[PDB]
Amino acid sequence: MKVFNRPILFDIVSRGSPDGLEGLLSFLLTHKKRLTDEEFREPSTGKTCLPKALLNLSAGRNDTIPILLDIAEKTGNMREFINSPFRDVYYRGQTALHIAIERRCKHYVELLVEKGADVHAQARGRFFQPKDEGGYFYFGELPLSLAACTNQPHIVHYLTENGHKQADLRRQDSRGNTVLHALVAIADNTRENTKFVTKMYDLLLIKCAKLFPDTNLEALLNNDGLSPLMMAAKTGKIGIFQHIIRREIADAAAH
Numbered sequence: 001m002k003v004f005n006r007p008i009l010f011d012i013v014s015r016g017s018p019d020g021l022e023g024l025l026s027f028l029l030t031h032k033k034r035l036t037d038e039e040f041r042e043p044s045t046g047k048t049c050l051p052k053a054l055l056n057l058s059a060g061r062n063d064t065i066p067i068l069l070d071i072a073e074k075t076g077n078m079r080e081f082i083n084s085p086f087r088d089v090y091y092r093g094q095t096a097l098h099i100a101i102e103r104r105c106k107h108y109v110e111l112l113v114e115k116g117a118d119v120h121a122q123a124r125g126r127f128f129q130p131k132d133e134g135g136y137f138y139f140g141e142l143p144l145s146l147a148a149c150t151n152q153p154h155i156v157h158y159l160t161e162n163g164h165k166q167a168d169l170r171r172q173d174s175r176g177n178t179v180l181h182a183l184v185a186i187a188d189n190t191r192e193n194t195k196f197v198t199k200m201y202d203l204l205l206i207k208c209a210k211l212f213p214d215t216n217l218e219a220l221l222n223n224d225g226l227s228p229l230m231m232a233a234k235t236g237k238i239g240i241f242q243h244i245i246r247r248e249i250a251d252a253a254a255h
């Protein structure tokens with residue numbers, strides 16, 4: 001019947017036309033193909049049509065997204081489809097969830113986590129000099145650390161509190177950095193930055209203590225052997241450094 005290939009699929013998805021996907025499920029089942037197959041991924045990056053959809057929004061929406069996820073499910077492919085990684089010059093291991101978070105799409109984030117997105121997928125930075133030139137924007141690799149570092153408390157709440165699959169607040173990336181180290185990494189000592197970073201830091205610190213009363217999140221060490229406080233001191237992050245100190249002092253005064 002209707003025939004689908006990569007340029008056709010990507011045309012439909014980049015325009016955001018749900019009607020264009022009529023016939024695709026039947027096509028995939030009849031020809032024994034999957035949306036993760038090489039023929040339906042961008043050769044240069046590894047993107048399936050899912051990242052393509054998320055990068056092509058109209059008023060924040062692309063109605064092919066729910067349809068593609070359903071098609072992936074019905075072809076026994078849902079997990080692989082959702083979590084299929086891609087790369088560019090800056091990161092490898094990027095997933096659809098990273099895109100949905102970076103584009104601030106709360107609804108798509110929920111949809112993807114509900115249908116089995118890897119809440120701990122790591123977008124690892126790429127470098128081209130012999131010592132990491134830091135050409136990429138570092139946010140701690142993980143979806144939770146991305147949400148935190150981009151000032152999205154609702155997504156932070158969702159990712160840690162949802163009933164399907166929760167991001168672990170204690171998680172560490174490839175540098176050994178927890179979300180707290182990541183917040184320190186992105187701190188730049190400007191007023192609005194210092195304001196959201198300290199608020200996010202405390203929200204996560206308190207939430208960790210509540211869930212794991214035995215556990216002090218700001219005690220966990222990165223691979224340099226540094227706590228967030230000490231990383232902050234070493235890297236000149238004055239505003240967050242000072243806030244952690246006053247908070248530590250206030251916390252002892254409480255008891």
Ligand SMILES: O=P(O)(O)O[C@@H]1[C@H](O)[C@H](O)[C@@H](OP(=O)(O)O)[C@H](OP(=O)(O)O)[C@H]1O
Pocket residue numbers: 104151152153154155196
């Ligand atoms: O400074 P705060 O207190 O952290 O407030 C956040 C700020 O307004 C963000 O710009 C916003 O993201 P949007 O631009 O997408 O609205 C976020 O919404 P969120 O919590 O729903 O992620 C707010 O929480």
